[PDB]
C-alpha cells in the first residue's frame, strides 16, 4: 500500500523531471536531463525507450506511467545493479565516498537552487557515524 | 400514458437497429426539430401467446421500471428517457440514440484492452455506482452487455429491469442474473434460508468480475458444468496465469485482489476504491514542504529513475527465431497475433449464455491424463 | 448499383442511367459515391475509358482476329485509349440541376481536346490512340505519354449531345421543356402511406364467432354490388390485352400477380370487383396451411406495400377468414389469428399503420381503374384391393404404383357410375390429408402431381444477383450441377428434376429450402457472409446428421422425423444452423468443414503468399504461381480455383486443418523478408505438427488410450478436440511445424525482423 508522504515525494520528483510545467516528460526534456548527468545516447534510442515505457505510440509520458514504473519491485539483483549505477553517478570522483561538495555539484547539475548551509545541514542529518560521510549500508538502508 | 395518436403523428419509425427476446429497437425522428432517437417497442401481449396474468405482470414490471428510472434521470452518464407512450398492446419507450453497439463486440474485435481506456471506464462506472448507492437504489445487473459506447468513448448504464428500491434495514433474499456473475451471498441465499441477506457487495463483485474479464480476456470463473462452477466460486481460489500477466503493474493486481473479497464487510466501497493510487493524478500545487531527508529521498528517486530507464530499455530481447522454433507463446507479439487470428477464425461462436463463452476458446490446461480427475 | 456487372468492377456507361436520360435512382448518396468512384478510377488526360482492360483499337491484338485468346496478362493494361463521350456527358449532368462551376471546368477541359475541320466548326474525335513505340514508358508512368487521334470521327452522338448541352447552357431553353413529365424530382422523399384492410367472414358461423370476441365483420353476402374472386381469374382476364387476329398477336402471356396489383380496386362493366391476395391459395402449395407463416407473410406484405406505394390513393387489402383458420373443434379461431386481428386493430401492425372498417367507407377514397378492353366489340384385383383396404400409407403406395405402371390418365373404374381417374382420386385424397395435418404423405402426393412453386425464377435471380453461385444436387460430380446464370422456368424445373433423379421428394425439399432462403436474405442479409457457394444437398445431409445427433437415432429415423416436421420447424432449424448456435470441438469442426466457412480476407492472403512462392502443392495437385499474374484477387476465377484445389480432400476436418495451416503460413511469411523459391506441402506441415504433439503428450506421461489413432487418418482425435489458441493449442504446433519446414528449405539464415 502507498502513503500520502510518498505520493508527495513522487509528485515532487516528477515535477523536477519536467523543467517546464506541461504535464508531459517530452523527448526534449528527457534528453536534456539525460545529457545533464553526462550520457549521450542517440535520438532513435530516445524514441525506443519512450515506446517501451508507454503502452502505445503516442510518444508521451504521463503521471500514471511514472507512478507504475516507480512502484515496481525490482527483486534483488537488479536492485544492487541500479543502486550501484546511482552510486557511481554520485561517485564521479574515484574515492567511493560522498562529500558535501560532490552533492552540491550534483544538485547544481540537476538544476536545484540551495545554499551551502542547506547541504551542510542535510549531510549532517543524513549521516550517522558523524564522519561527514555516507557508506554503502547507510545509502542502501535510506533508499525508499 | 397518452393516446397512440400523439406518437403516430409525432414520431415516424425507421429501419431496424437490433432485435431482442420480445422487443426490437427502431430509429425514429422528431418532426418539429428533426432530432434522431431510438424507440423500444414492447409487446405486452407477446403476440397473443401470453396468459393475461403474464400480460399484467409485464405491465406492472414496465411501470415499475419507468417510475424508478424517472427519479434517476439527470446524471450525464445515464440513459435519458425522452418520451413515453402507452397502449393496450404496446409500450413505446424513447431513449437517446447511441451510435454503435455495446462492449461485447468491441471486446471480441479487440480481444483484450489496455489500461488507458480501462482507467476511464472504471472511473466512470465507479462514479455511477457511487451515485446510485447514494440514492439508495440498487441494480444487481452490471454485465458488459448493458454498457453502451459512443463515438467519443462514453459509457452509460442501461437495462435496469432488475433494479429496485431498498428500504433501510431490509435484506433482500431473491436470486436472479447470470450464474457467472452471482456473488457468494446470493448463492448462499439459494442453499440456506437462514442467511440474512445481501446488499451493495454483489455490485462490487460484479465490478471486479467485469474488470477481470476486460483485463485478462477470460472470466475468472467458468466451467462446462454449473455445479462445479458454483463450487469453484464458493471456494474463492482464483489464480493468476503464469505466461499471461508478466507485463502488468503490481498496483492493478493489488486492486484486483482488493475488489474480490469473500467477506462482505472487507469488500471495498466505491469511495474507498476511488481513493486508490491507481486513479491518482495531479494538476498543479506548490505547497510541497518537508525535511532535508525528503529532499535527499526525492533526489535519490530521480537519479534512480534516470538510471533505471536505460536499463529497462536494454532489457529487450531480439526476435530469436530459434526460440520461435522451441516456443512461440513466450513472445508477446506472437501470442497476440495467434490470439487475434484464432478469434477471427472462430469469431461467430461467442454469444450470450453460459453454454458458449470466451473462456471456451483458450486452453491453458495441460491436456493429458490429468483430465480424468474432474470432480467427486 | 456500385458495379456494372459481376465481371466488370465499373463501367462508365452507368453515368447515362444516373444523368440526363432516364433518371432511375434513389438514395443520392449512392449517386455521389459512384460519381466519385468513376472520377477517381476512369479519369484520364484527354478522355475517359469505358472500362479496365479493353483492347479495342490497340497496336497489339492483331485487329484482323477476334475471339481474344486467354492471354491478356499485361497486353491490355493502362493502355485503354480514351472516350470523350463520357466527358461531354459531365457538362450536361452538371448544368441540369444546379451546378455551374463544374460546367465551366468541364467546358474548359473539353475545349482543349477539340479538333477544327472544314469551315472551322467543332468536331468530336472518337478516341486518341497510344503511339506504338512509346508503350514501355506508359507502363511505368501511366497517363503521361501523349496520344494521337485515330479512327472514325464524324461522331454524331457526342456532337449532338454537346450541341444540346451548349444550347441548354446558353439559356435559350429551360430544363423544364426537355422533360414535360417532370422526371427531375425523383430525389424528393415521400413521408409514408396509410394502409386500409377489410375483414370478411365466409359464413354465418364465422361471423358469430368473431362477434363473440368483439370483432364486427360482415359476411360474403349483403354486399351484392361488390364481388370477390381469386387472382387467377384476374390473370386470365389480363391475358387478353392487346390481342389482334390479323397480325397474329396472342396478347399478354399468363403470369403471376404481385400483391401490389390486387390491392387497387377495379371496374368491369359498371361493377366493382376486389381480388384476394395470391398467398391464401391452398390449391397450389401447402405452406398456406400453417397459421404462423400466414402471419409472417401478412407482416412482410404489409411492410412491402407500406414501403413504396408509388400509386395515388390509399391501398385496400381484403383478408377473408377461411374454415381452415379455425381450431380442431371448429368453434373458435386460432390464437395467432385473434392476436393478429387485435394487432391491426389500434392502428399498428408489423411495420405499418393499419386502419380497419367497411368497404362502403373505403369506396369514396380508394384508387379505381376503369377497364375498357373487356367491353363488347390383374389390375381389377389391385383396384378391388385399393377399394377394400384402409390407411393413408398403402393408399399412397397403391396410387403411385398404378399411376407409374398403367394409370397416368387411365380410368380406374372403381365406381361403376362415374369414371374415376387416378388423378381425380389423387386430388380427392388431398381433402382427407389436409384435415389430419399429417406431413408424412402430403409431400409424397405432391411429388406425384409434380406441383411447382410460383415465382421460383424470381427467387433464383435474387439469389444470383448477390454475387452468388447456386448448386443443385448431392455430391459428387458429374451429376452435381452449377447454375451460374438465370434460366427459364421450364429449364429450371427440368434441371432440378434431373438433379433430384427419382427421389422425387428431393425436388420439393430443394424448392422449399430455396424459398426459405428467398424470404430470408432480404430481411437479414448478414448471415450469408463467410460463404461463397451454397449446396442444397449438402445442407440437407447436414440437417439429417444434426437431427440424428439430436435424437440419437439412425439415419432413417432422422429422415422420417425431418420429413414430418411442420414447415415452421424447417425455417427455425435453418435459422438455427445459419446462425451457428470429446464431442464438442470435433462436431463444430465437422460442421465448418461441411459449410467450408472460409474467412473474409482468405483469398487476399492466399494471393499475397502465392506472390512470394512457386506454389502450394496439396497431395500431388499443384497451384502454380503463374496464376497470380493472369488474374486479380477481386474476380471470381481465383476463388473458384482455390476452392477446387482445397476441395480435393473429402474429409471436412482435413480441409479445416489445411485452412489453419495455410493461414499460419500466411502470418509467418510476413515476419521474414525472403523468397522461398520452392513449393510448399501443407500436408507435411500438418503431419510434422501432429508428430510434435504426439511426442509432447508421450513425454508428459499420458497413457496410450487417449493417444488414439483414427481408422483412416493418421491424426489423433485429441488434436481435433484441441482448441486452436492457448499455450497447448494446435496453432502453436502448426506454427512450429511451418517454421521447421521453412528452415528446411532456407539457405542457413532466417534473418527475420519485424
- The three-state DSSP-derived secondary structure of C156-220 is HHHHHHHHHHHHHHHCCCCHHHHCCCCHHHCCCCCCCCCEEEEEEECCHHHHHHHHHCCCCCEEC
**Residue C261: its H or E element:** helix C259-262
Burial class (CB in 10 A: 0-12, 13-18, 19+), C248: exposed
CA distance C399 to chain B (A): 41
Region of residue C309 (left: phi > 0; alpha: psi -120 to 50; beta: else): left
Measured between alpha carbons, how far is C510 from A73 in angstroms, rounded to an integer? 68
Label the pairing between strands C249-250 and C243-244: antiparallel
Contact C416, C430 (CB under 8 A): no
The verdict on whether omega for the bond into residue C476 sits within 30 degrees of 0, i.e. cis, is yes
Measured between alpha carbons, how far is B276 from B269 in angstroms, rounded to an integer? 11
Region of residue C294 (left: phi > 0; alpha: psi -120 to 50; beta: else): alpha
Give the resolution to one decimal, in Å.
4.2
Contact B2, B85 (CB under 8 A): yes
The position carrying cell 494471393 is C607
Contact C483, C471 (CB under 8 A): yes
Could you tell me if B363 lies within 8 Å of chain C, comparing CB atoms?
Answer: yes
CB atoms within 10 A of CB C460: 18
In chain A, residues with a C-beta closer than 8 Å to the C-beta of B296 are 122, 126, 142
Grid cell digits, residue A121: 545541514
Identify the DSSP state of B278.
Answer: G
Residues A12, B316: C-beta atoms closer than 8 Å = no
Question: Which string of DSSP letters, residue by residue, matches B194-233?
Answer: -S--B-THHHHHHHHHHHHHHHTSS-SS--SSHHHHHHHH
**Residue B91: its H or E element:** strand B90-95
In chain C, residues with a C-beta closer than 8 Å to the C-beta of B325 are 736, 739-740, 743
3-state helix/strand/coil string of A48-70: HHHHHHCCCCCCCCCHHHHHHHH
Burial class (CB in 10 A: 0-12, 13-18, 19+), C321: buried
Region of residue A44 (left: phi > 0; alpha: psi -120 to 50; beta: else): alpha
Measured between alpha carbons, how far is B196 from B200 in angstroms, rounded to an integer? 14
CB-defined contacts B:C, below 8 A: 117
**Bridge partners of C274?**
C228
Sheet holding C368-370, edge to edge: C226-229, C272-275, C265-267, C368-370
Query: Best residue in B48, B112, B218, B351 to probe C by mutation, most C CBs within 10 Å?
Result: B48
Q: Per the residue annotation, which of B6, B96, B105, B141 is the catalytic one?
A: B141
Label the pairing between strands B11-19 and B35-43: unpaired
The position carrying cell 500477466 is B245
Cβ contacts of C324-333, under 8 Å, gap ≥ 24: C324/C282, C324/C289, C324/C434, C325/C291, C325/C294, C326/C206, C326/C209, C331/C209, C332/C209, C333/C206, C333/C209, C333/C210
Q: Is C680 helix (H, G, I), strand (E, B) or coil?
A: strand
Contact C146, C79 (CB under 8 A): no
Phi, psi of B192 (to 5 degrees): -120, 130
| Stretch 211-250 of chain B: residues touching chain C, C-beta under 8 Å | 243
Q: Which has the closest alpha carbon to B332: A69, B358, B340, B365?
A: B340
> Is residue A56 part of an annotated ligand binding site?
yes
Residue set of the binding site of B for ATP: 17-25, 40
Could you tell me if B8 lies within 8 Å of chain A, comparing CB atoms?
Answer: no
Q: Is C330 helix (H, G, I), strand (E, B) or coil?
A: coil
Measured between alpha carbons, how far is C551 from C546 in angstroms, rounded to an integer? 9
Burial class (CB in 10 A: 0-12, 13-18, 19+), B111: middle
Could you tell me if B90 lies within 8 Å of chain C, comparing CB atoms?
Answer: yes
Grid cell digits, residue C732: 502453436
Of A9, A34, A45, the CB nearest to B301: A9
Contact B82, C340 (CB under 8 A): no
Measured between alpha carbons, how far is B347 from C672 in angstroms, rounded to an integer? 28
Contact C262, C244 (CB under 8 A): no
Residues B49, C335: C-beta atoms closer than 8 Å = yes
Measured between alpha carbons, how far is C544 from C538 in angstroms, rounded to an integer? 10
Cβ contacts of A77-80, under 8 Å, gap ≥ 24: A78/B311
Measured between alpha carbons, how far is A76 from C724 in angstroms, rounded to an integer? 39
Measured between alpha carbons, how far is C80 from C128 in angstroms, rounded to an integer? 10
Measured between alpha carbons, how far is A56 from B108 in angstroms, rounded to an integer? 20
Grid cell digits, residue C177: 421543356
**Dihedral sign computed on CA atoms, order B345, B349, B350, B355:** negative
**Bridge partners of C368?**
C265
CA distance B367 to chain C (A): 8
> Is residue A58 part of an annotated ligand binding site?
yes
- What is the C-alpha end-to-end distance of chain A, expressed in Å? 14
Q: Is C318 helix (H, G, I), strand (E, B) or coil?
A: strand
CA torsion, points B242, B245, B249, B254, in degrees to nearest 10? Answer: -70
Measured between alpha carbons, how far is B85 from B2 in angstroms, rounded to an integer? 6
**Bridge partners of C265?**
C368
Of C348, C723, C735, the CB nearest to B363: C723
CA distance A138 to chain B (A): 13
Residues 6+ apart with CB under 8 A from C122: C114, C116, C159, C162
What are the helix and strand counts (H, E) for chain A? 8, 0
CA distance B348 to chain C (A): 7
What are the helix and strand counts (H, E) for chain C? 30, 17
Residues B324, C739: C-beta atoms closer than 8 Å = yes
The position carrying cell 480455383 is C641
Which residue of B lies nearest to C354 if distances are taken between CA atoms?
Answer: B8
Cα distances (angstroms) measured from residue C91 to each of B108, B353, C96, C105, C107:
49, 59, 9, 9, 7
Length of chain B: 376
In chain C, residues with a C-beta closer than 8 Å to the C-beta of B49 are 335-336, 339
Label the pairing between strands C195-201 and C317-321: parallel
In chain C, residues with a C-beta closer than 8 Å to the C-beta of B364 are 726-728
**Residue C370: its H or E element:** strand C368-370
Could you tell me if B349 lies within 8 Å of chain A, comparing CB atoms?
Answer: no
Contact B329, B241 (CB under 8 A): no
Q: Using N-to-C axis directions, what is the helix angle for C730-744 and B332-345, rounded to 10°?
A: 120
Measured between alpha carbons, how far is A15 from C654 in angstroms, rounded to an integer? 62
Whether residue B67 lies in the annotated active site: no
Grid cell digits, residue B207: 465490478
Length of chain C: 754
Q: Is B12 helix (H, G, I), strand (E, B) or coil?
A: strand
Return the biggest CA–CA distance within chain B.
Answer: 81
Could you tell me if A21 lies within 8 Å of chain B, comparing CB atoms?
Answer: yes
Label the pairing between strands B155-157 and B147-149: antiparallel
Residues B48, C343: C-beta atoms closer than 8 Å = yes
Q: Which has the closest alpha carbon to C210: C221, C194, C199, C220?
A: C199
> Is residue A136 part of an annotated ligand binding site?
no
The position carrying cell 462508365 is C12
- What is the C-alpha end-to-end distance of chain B, expressed in Å? 56
Label the pairing between strands C148-149 and C128-129: antiparallel
Grid cell digits, residue B233: 466460486
Which residue of C lies nearest to B361 if distances are taken between CA atoms?
Answer: C723
Contact B157, B111 (CB under 8 A): no
Which residue of B lies nearest to C343 if distances are taken between CA atoms?
Answer: B89
Grid cell digits, residue C600: 473474409
Measured between alpha carbons, how far is B306 from A70 in angstroms, rounded to an integer? 11
Measured between alpha carbons, how far is C604 from B99 in angstroms, rounded to an integer? 31
**Bridge partners of C319?**
C199
Q: Which has the closest alpha carbon to A61: A90, A23, A92?
A: A23
Grid cell digits, residue B215: 483485463
> Is residue A54 part of an annotated ligand binding site?
yes
Measured between alpha carbons, how far is A19 from C86 in angstroms, rounded to an integer? 64
> Is residue A24 part of an annotated ligand binding site?
yes
Compute the C-alpha angle C605/C611/C616, nearest 5°.
75
In chain B, residues with a C-beta closer than 8 Å to the C-beta of C667 are 337, 341
Measured between alpha carbons, how far is C206 from C594 in angstroms, rounded to an integer? 50
Phi, psi of B122 (to 5 degrees): -65, -40
**Residue A138: its H or E element:** helix A136-142
In chain B, residues with a C-beta closer than 8 Å to the C-beta of A106 are 299
R_g over Cα of chain A: 17
3-state helix/strand/coil string of B130-199: HHHHHCCEECCCCCHHHEEECCCCCEEECCCCCCEECCCCCCECCCCCCHHHCCHHHHHHHHCCCCCCEC
Query: Best residue in C729, C741, C746, C750 to probe B by mutation, most B CBs within 10 Å?
Result: C729
Q: Which has the closest alpha carbon to C275: C355, C350, C200, C181?
A: C200
In chain B, residues with a C-beta closer than 8 Å to the C-beta of A19 are none
Phi, psi of C696 (to 5 degrees): -65, -45
Grid cell digits, residue B90: 404496446
Measured between alpha carbons, how far is C385 from C393 in angstroms, rounded to an integer? 14
Question: Which string of DSSP letters, residue by residue, matches C437-480?
Answer: T-TTTHHHHHHHHT---TTHHHHHHHHHTTT-BB--S-SSTTT-
Measured between alpha carbons, how far is C721 from C728 in angstroms, rounded to an integer? 12
Label the pairing between strands C128-129 and C272-275: unpaired
Residues 6+ apart with CB under 8 A from B311: A78, A81, A82, A85
Measured between alpha carbons, how far is C401 from C136 in angstroms, rounded to an integer? 75
Residues 6+ apart with CB under 8 A from C158: C84, C85, C88, C124
Of B293, B296, B312, the CB nearest to A52: B312
Contact C278, C231 (CB under 8 A): yes
Measured between alpha carbons, how far is C533 from C597 in angstroms, rounded to an integer? 10
The verdict on whether omega for the bond into residue C508 sits within 30 degrees of 0, i.e. cis, is no
Measured between alpha carbons, how far is B363 from C722 in angstroms, rounded to an integer? 8
| Stretch 260-319 of chain B: residues touching chain C, C-beta under 8 Å | 319
CA torsion, points C439, C442, C447, C452, in degrees to nearest 10? Answer: -100
User: Chains with 3 or more CB pairs closer than 8 angstroms to C?
Assistant: B
Residues C336, B368: C-beta atoms closer than 8 Å = no
Cα distances (angstroms) measured from residue B1 to each of B7, B65, B66, B164, C25:
11, 14, 11, 22, 42
Of A52, A72, A82, the CB nearest to B316: A52
Percent of chain C that is helix, strand, coil (3-state, to 5): 50, 10, 45
Measured between alpha carbons, how far is B33 from B81 in angstroms, rounded to an integer? 17
The position carrying cell 384476374 is C234
Of B13, B361, B367, the CB nearest to C718: B367
Amino acid at each position: 500500500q502507498l502513503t500520502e508522504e510518498q505520493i508527495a515525494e513522487f509528485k515532487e520528483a516528477f515535477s523536477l523531471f519536467d523543467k517546464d510545467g506541461d504535464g508531459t516528460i517530452t523527448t526534449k526534456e528527457l534528453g536534456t536531463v539525460m545529457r545533464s548527468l553526462g550520457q549521450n545516447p542517440t535520438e532513435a534510442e530516445l524514441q525506443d525507450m519512450i515506446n517501451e515505457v508507454d503502452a502505445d505510440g503516442n510518444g508521451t509520458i504521463d503521471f500514471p506511467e511514472f507512478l507504475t514504473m516507480m512502484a515496481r519491485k525490482m527483486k534483488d539483483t537488479d536492485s544492487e545493479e541500479e543502486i550501484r549505477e546511482a552510486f557511481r553517478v554520485f561517485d564521479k570522483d574515484g574515492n567511493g565516498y560522498i562529500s558535501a561538495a560532490e552533492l552540491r555539484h550534483v544538485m547544481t547539475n540537476l538544476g536545484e537552487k540551495l545554499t551551502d548551509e542547506e547541504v551542510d545541514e542535510m549531510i549532517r542529518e543524513a549521516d550517522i557515524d558523524g564522519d561527514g560521510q555516507v557508506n554503502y549500508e547507510e545509502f542502501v538502508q535510506m533508499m525508499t | 400514458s397518452h393516446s397512440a395518436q400523439d406518437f403516430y403523428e409525432n414520431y415516424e419509425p425507421k429501419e431496424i437497429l437490433g432485435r431482442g427476446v420480445s422487443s426490437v429497437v427502431r430509429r425514429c425522428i422528431h418532426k418539429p426539430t428533426s432530432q434522431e432517437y431510438a424507440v423500444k417497442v414492447i409487446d405486452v401481449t407477446g403476440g397473443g401467446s401470453f396468459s393475461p396474468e403474464e400480460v399484467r405482470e409485464l405491465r406492472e414490471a414496465t411501470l415499475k421500471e419507468v417510475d424508478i428510472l424517472r427519479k434517476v434521470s439527470g446524471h450525464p452518464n445515464i440513459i435519458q428517457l425522452k418520451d413515453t407512450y402507452e397502449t393496450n398492446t404496446f409500450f413505446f419507450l424513447v431513449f437517446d440514440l447511441m451510435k454503435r453497439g455495446e462492449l461485447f463486440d468491441y471486446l471480441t474485435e479487440k480481444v483484450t484492452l489496455s489500461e488507458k481506456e480501462t482507467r476511464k471506464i472504471m472511473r466512470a462506472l465507479l462514479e455511477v455506482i457511487c451515485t446510485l448507492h447514494k440514492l439508495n437504489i440498487v441494480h444487481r445487473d452490471l454485465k458488459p452487455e448493458n454498457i453502451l459506447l459512443d463515438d467519443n468513448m462514453n459509457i452509460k448504464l442501461t437495462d435496469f429491469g432488475f433494479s429496485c428500491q431498498l428500504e433501510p434495514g431490509e435484506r433482500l433474499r431473491e436470486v436472479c442474473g447470470t450464474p457467472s456473475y452471482l456473488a457468494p451471498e446470493i448463492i448462499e441465499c439459494s442453499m440456506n434460508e437462514d442467511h440474512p441477506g445481501y446488499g451493495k457487495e454483489v455490485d462490487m463483485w460484479s465490478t471486479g468480475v467485469i474488470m477481470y474479464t476486460l483485463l485478462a480476456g477470460s472470466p475468472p470463473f467458468w466451467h462446462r458444468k454449473q455445479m462445479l462452477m458454483l463450487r469453484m466460486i464458493m471456494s474463492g481460489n482464483y489464480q493468476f496465469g503464469s505466461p499471461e500477466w508478466d507485463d502488468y503493474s503490481d498496483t492493478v493486481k493489488d486492486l484486483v485482489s482488493r475488489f474480490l473479497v469473500v467477506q462482505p464487510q472487507n469488500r471495498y466501497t466505491a469511495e474507498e476504491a476511488l481513493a486508490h493510487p491507481f486513479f491518482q493524478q495531479y494538476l498543479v500545487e506548490e505547497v510541497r514542504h518537508f525535511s532535508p531527508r525528503g529532499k535527499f529521498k526525492v533526489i535519490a528517486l530521480t537519479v534512480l529513475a534516470s538510471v533505471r530507464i536505460y536499463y529497462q530499455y536494454r532489457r529487450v530481447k531480439p526476435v530469436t527465431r530459434e526460440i520461435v522454433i522451441r516456443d512461440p507463446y513466450a513472445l508477446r507479439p506472437l501470442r497476440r497475433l495467434i490470439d487475434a487470428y484464432a478469434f477471427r477464425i472462430y469469431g461467430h461462436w461467442v454469444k450470450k449464455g453460459q453454454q458458449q463463452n470466451r473462456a471456451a476458446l483458450f486452453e491453458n490446461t495441460p491436456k493429458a491424463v490429468l483430465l480424468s480427475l474432474a470432480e467427486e | 448499383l456500385p458495379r456494372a456487372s459481376t465481371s466488370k468492377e465499373v463501367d462508365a456507361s452507368l453515368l447515362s442511367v444516373v444523368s440526363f436520360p432516364a433518371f432511375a435512382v434513389e438514395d443520392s448518396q449512392l449517386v455521389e459515391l459512384t460519381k466519385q468512384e468513376i472520377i477517381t478510377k476512369l479519369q484520364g488526360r484527354y478522355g475517359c475509358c469505358r472500362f479496365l482492360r479493353d483492347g479495342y483499337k490497340t497496336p497489339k491484338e492483331d485487329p484482323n482476329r477476334l475471339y481474344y485468346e486467354p492471354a491478356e496478362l499485361k497486353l491490355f493494361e493502362n493502355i485503354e485509349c480514351e472516350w470523350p463521350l463520357f466527358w461531354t456527358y459531365f457538362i450536361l449532368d452538371g448544368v441540369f440541376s444546379g451546378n455551374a462551376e463544374q460546367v465551366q471546368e468541364y467546358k474548359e477541359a473539353l475545349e482543349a481536346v477539340l479538333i477544327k475541320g472544314k469551315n472551322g466548326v467543332p468536331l468530336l474525335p472518337e478516341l486518341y490512340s497510344v503511339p506504338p513505340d512509346r508503350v514501355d514508358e506508359e507502363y511505368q508512368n501511366p497517363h503521361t505519354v501523349d496520344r494521337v487521334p485515330m479512327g472514325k470521327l464524324p461522331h454524331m452522338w457526342g456532337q449532338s449531345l454537346y450541341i444540346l448541352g451548349s444550347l441548354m447552357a446558353e439559356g435559350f431553353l429551360a430544363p423544364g421543356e426537355i422533360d414535360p413529365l417532370n422526371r427531375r424530382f425523383s430525389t424528393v422523399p415521400k413521408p409514408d402511406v396509410v394502409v386500409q384492410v377489410s375483414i370478411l367472414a365466409e359464413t354465418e358461423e364465422i361471423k358469430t364467432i368473431l362477434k363473440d370476441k368483439g370483432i364486427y365483420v360482415e359476411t360474403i353476402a349483403e354486399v351484392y354490388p361488390i364481388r370477390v374472386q381469386p387472382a387467377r381469374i384476374l390473370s386470365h382476364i389480363y391475358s387478353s390485352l392487346g390481342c389482334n387476329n390479323r397480325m397474329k398477336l396472342s396478347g399478354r402471356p399468363y403470369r403471376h400477380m404481385g400483391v401490389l396489383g390486387t390491392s387497387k380496386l377495379y371496374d368491369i362493366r359498371k361493377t366493382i370487383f376486389t381480388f384476394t391476395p395470391q398467398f391464401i391459395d391452398q390449391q397450389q402449395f401447402y405452406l398456406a396451411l400453417d397459421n404462423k407463416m400466414i402471419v409472417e407473410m401478412l407482416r412482410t406484405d404489409l411492410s412491402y406495400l407500406c414501403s413504396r406505394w408509388r400509386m395515388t390513393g390509399q391501398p385496400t387489402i381484403t383478408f377473408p377468414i377461411s374454415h381452415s383458420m379455425l381450431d380442431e373443434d371448429g368453434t373458435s379461431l386460432n390464437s395467432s389469428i385473434l392476436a393478429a386481428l387485435r394487432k391491426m386493430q389500434d392502428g399498428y401492425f408489423g411495420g405499418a399503420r393499419v386502419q380497419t372498417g367497411k368497404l362502403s367507407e373505403f369506396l369514396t377514397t380508394s384508387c379505381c381503374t376503369h377497364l375498357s378492353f373487356m367491353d363488347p366489340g390383374d389390375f381389377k384385383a389391385l383396384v378391388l384391393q385399393l377399394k377394400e383396404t384402409s390407411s393413408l400409407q398403402e393408399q399412397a403406395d397403391i396410387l403411385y404404383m398404378l399411376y407409374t405402371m398403367k394409370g397416368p390418365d387411365w380410368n380406374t373404374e372403381l365406381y361403376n357410375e362415374r369414371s374415376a381417374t387416378v388423378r381425380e382420386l389423387l386430388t380427392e385424397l388431398y381433402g382427407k390429408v389436409g384435415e389430419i395435418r399429417h406431413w408424412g404423405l402430403i409431400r409424397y402426393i405432391s411429388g406425384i402431381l409434380r406441383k411447382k412453386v410460383e415465382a421460383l425464377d424470381e427467387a433464383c435471380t435474387d439469389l444470383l444477383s448477390h454475387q452468388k453461385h447456386l448448386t443443385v444436387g448431392l455430391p459428387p460430380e458429374p451429376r452435381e450441377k452449377t447454375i451460374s446464370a438465370p434460366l427459364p422456368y421450364e429449364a429450371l424445373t427440368q434441371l432440378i428434376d434431373e438433379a433430384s433423379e427419382g427421389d422425387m421428394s428431393i425436388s420439393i425439399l430443394t424448392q422449399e429450402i430455396m424459398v426459405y432462403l428467398a424470404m430470408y436474405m432480404r430481411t437479414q442479409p448478414g448471415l450469408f457472409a463467410e460463404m461463397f457457394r451454397l449446396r442444397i444437398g449438402l445442407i440437407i445431409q447436414v440437417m439429417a446428421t444434426e437431427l440424428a445427433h439430436s435424437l440419437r437415432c439412425s439415419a432413417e429415423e432422422a429422415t422420417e422425423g425431418l420429413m414430418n416436421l411442420s414447415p415452421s420447424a424447417m425455417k427455425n432449424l435453418l435459422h438455427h444452423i445459419l446462425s451457428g448456435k470429446q464431442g464438442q470441438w470435433q462436431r463444430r469442426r465437422r460442421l465448418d468443414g461441411a459449410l467450408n466457412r472460409v474467412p473474409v480476407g482468405f483469398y487476399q492472403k492466399v494471393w499475397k503468399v502465392l506472390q512470394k512462392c512457386h506454389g502450394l502443392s496439396v497431395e500431388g495437385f499443384v497451384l502454380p504461381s503463374s496464376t497470380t499474374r493472369e488474374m486479380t484477387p477481386g474476380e471470381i476465377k481465383f476463388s473458384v480455383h482455390v476452392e477446387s484445389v482445397l476441395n480435393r480432400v473429402p474429409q471436412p476436418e482435413y480441409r479445416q486443418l489445411l485452412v489453419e495451416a495455410i493461414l499460419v503460413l500466411t502470418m509467418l511469411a510476413d515476419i521474414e523478408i525472403h523468397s522461398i523459391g520452392s513449393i510448399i506441402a501443407v500436408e507435411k506441415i500438418v503431419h510434422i505438427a501432429n508428430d510434435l504433439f504426439l511426442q509432447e503428450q508421450k513425454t508428459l506421461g499420458a497413457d496410450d488410450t487417449m493417444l488414439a489413432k483414427d481408422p483412416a487418418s493418421g491424426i489423433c482425435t485429441l488434436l481435433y478436440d484441441s482448441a486452436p489458441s492457448g499455450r497447448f493449442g494446435t496453432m502453436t504446433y502448426l506454427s512450429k511445424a511451418a517454421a521447421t519446414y521453412v528452415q528446411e528449405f532456407l539457405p542457413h539464415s532466417i534473418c527475420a525482423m519485424q
